């Protein structure tokens, strides 16, 4: 492939460099339209800019935490982190979010990796070996109330059991209701005067519940869960302007008030180098 062809002096009536940008086109002008060039080859394919590659590496999408401790006398397991739960989403953390929102609709399979590490902040004789159980609780299915409810039987709901310190990995097909996931949605769930605006109403994916299977030892053990997400088989439509201001909320476009100028001011003139 040639990156530049050889081109010499020109004295024409045919001027490729004068255009009318009002038309909305970006005319494909090249170095050889306005200087004299020599042949050179590309030596490159643009492999690593493919959208599959761009969205295809694992990104941390969520960090939660649960603890193993005596539940005796706990009136609210959920509240004691005896078993936390997460509202599956892909915008709570922003590195990956800005990347996805370069597109309007996106379609892909997900590969999740879940790393779990334990901490024992206060005096323990040892490090126990805990097994985590993460359940998929899609919307419409009983959601766990205690850390050892009938729910955890999970007879119809996919669940994975792995050890703290290890990693769990599995992959979920594209579960969207439509043909693509909306990265943006300028609508409502119905014509209500006070219903919420945005996509919050659209990515009704449900939540995922984590717990330790082990009963309690004499000390307490903090287990912190990190969920990583990798898109595989990516398809993206309609590019948009990149995110400039900071994010404030999952699912709304809102930016913070009295934010700071995002364009760097010159130290000098327009004329400055």
């Amino acid at each position: 492939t040639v990156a530049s062809i050889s081109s010499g002096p020109k004295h024409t009536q045919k001027v490729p460099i004068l255009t009318a940008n009002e038309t909305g086109a970006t005319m494909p002008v090249l170095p050889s339209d306005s200087i004299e060039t020599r042949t050179t080859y590309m030596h490159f394919n643009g492999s690593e800019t493919d959208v599959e590659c761009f969205l295809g590496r694992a990104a941390c999408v969520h960090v939660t935490e649960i603890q193993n401790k005596d539940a005796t006398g706990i009136d609210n397991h959920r509240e004691a982190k005896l078993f936390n739960d997460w509202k599956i989403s892909l915008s709570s953390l922003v590195q990956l979010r800005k990347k996805l929102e370069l597109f309007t609709y996106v379609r892909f399979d997900s590969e999740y990796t879940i790393l779990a590490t334990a901490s024992q902040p206060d005096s323990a004789n040892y490090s126990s070996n805990l097994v985590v159980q993460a359940m998929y609780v899609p919307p419409g299915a009983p959601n766990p109330k205690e850390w050892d409810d009938y729910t955890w039987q999970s007879a119809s709901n996919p669940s994975v059991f792995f050890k703290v310190g290890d990693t769990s990995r599995f992959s979920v097909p594209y579960v969207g209701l439509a043909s693509a996931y909306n990265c943006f949605y300028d609508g409502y769930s119905h014509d209500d005067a006070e219903t919420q605006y945005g996509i919050t109403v659209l990515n009704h994916m449900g939540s995922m519940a984590f717990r330790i299977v082990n009963e309690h030892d004499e000390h307490k053990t903090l287990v912190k869960i990190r969920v990583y997400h990798r898109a595989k088989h990516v398809e993206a439509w309609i590019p948009r302007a990149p995110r400039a201001l900071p994010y404030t909320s999952i699912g709304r476009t809102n930016y913070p008030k009295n934010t700071e100028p995002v364009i760097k001011k010159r130290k000098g003139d327009i004329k400055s180098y």
Partner: protein, 59 residues
Amino acid sequence: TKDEVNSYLIPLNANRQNEQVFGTNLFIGDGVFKTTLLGEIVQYYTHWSGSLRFSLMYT
């Protein structure tokens, strides 16, 4: 107020004109539908799509 054979019966009144016999929304996973076999199976899945057949037999 307690489950009875009678909640399967939609009553009809002689001589009423213009009026309404019954009403329900179509949340097949809840409400009237929920205990029916259809309702009961739909509940093992997260998503549904398709046509429903609703019939009335007169007695």
